[PDB]
Amino acid sequence: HWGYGKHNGPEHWHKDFPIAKGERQSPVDIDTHTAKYDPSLKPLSVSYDQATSLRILNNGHAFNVEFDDSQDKAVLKGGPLDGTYRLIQFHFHWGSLDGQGSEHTVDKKKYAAELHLVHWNTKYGDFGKAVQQPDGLAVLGIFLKVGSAKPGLQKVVDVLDSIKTKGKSADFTNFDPRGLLPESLDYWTYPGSLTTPPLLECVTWIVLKEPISVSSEQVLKFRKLNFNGEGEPEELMVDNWRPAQPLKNRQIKASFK
Ligand SMILES: Cc1ccc2c(C)c(C(=O)NCc3ccc(S(N)(=O)=O)cc3)oc2c1C
Numbered sequence: 001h002w003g004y005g006k007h008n009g010p011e012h013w014h015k016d017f018p019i020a021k022g023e024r025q026s027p028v029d030i031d032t033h034t035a036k037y038d039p040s041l042k043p044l045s046v047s048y049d050q051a052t053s054l055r056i057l058n059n060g061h062a063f064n065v066e067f068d069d070s071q072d073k074a075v076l077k078g079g080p081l082d083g084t085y086r087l088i089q090f091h092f093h094w095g096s097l098d099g100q101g102s103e104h105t106v107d108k109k110k111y112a113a114e115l116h117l118v119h120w121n122t123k124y125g126d127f128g129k130a131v132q133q134p135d136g137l138a139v140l141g142i143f144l145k146v147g148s149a150k151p152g153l154q155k156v157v158d159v160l161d162s163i164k165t166k167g168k169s170a171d172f173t174n175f176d177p178r179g180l181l182p183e184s185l186d187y188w189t190y191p192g193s194l195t196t197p198p199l200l201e202c203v204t205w206i207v208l209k210e211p212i213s214v215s216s217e218q219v220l221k222f223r224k225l226n227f228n229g230e231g232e233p234e235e236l237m238v239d240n241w242r243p244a245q246p247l248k249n250r251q252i253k254a255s256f257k
């Protein structure tokens, strides 16, 4: 099955998922000089005051912090979006070393990690239907650099020991994702895809310009997770990122001058 190694990693995915070579694949390199400021873009509206986290899960590729998405409790609106997108989960991609780990790049710069807050368009009723539509998902991407600790991340870091291996989950209630957001909501946006199989071309990407800082100790704890299940040979969960894909016929738009 697919993963991140020599024999099952990103360069192999197209065999099972031919859309891997499609026209709107993610991630991409964001060339900051060619991205055009679009004064028609609205401020992003991130309304996470009522977010209800439920659980954290090691799915063998990353860990997901899951939310109750059965009502309009945490939603993303505005920006490039039409209508209302509900938060379902967040996860990260990260590296074996601080110099890699992000999926998007900025002028070819790789960050240590990238946070993806995943939202689905409520006009399609649920997530499985939304992924079948070109405007089904909105993923808010936030870069992580290593420096000062992010206090709002620590609750996530400290539960990881309890979900070391694939298929483990833990109750994870009352986690406030507002604590993971940088000061500025300036962003780039473009039409793309899921960055893991099935690689569906259903995502409006919104990538924040301002990274958050996390500590070396925080990211080191991400790197102690395992891709393998309990009672299997240890494979550290590192380098779970897809490299930048061809931009093809797309334009990246900036919300800021
Ligand atoms: C076997 C199987 C069959 C179908 C699906 C679908 C339809 C998804 C899916 O939609 N996963 C959610 C998802 C959310 C966000 C991202 S990201 N990194 O933010 O672009 C990537 C993937 O996973 C599937 C699996 C694992």
Ligand SMILES: [Zn+2]
Pocket (backbone or CB within 6 Å): 091, 092, 093, 116, 195
């Ligand atoms: Zn992701």
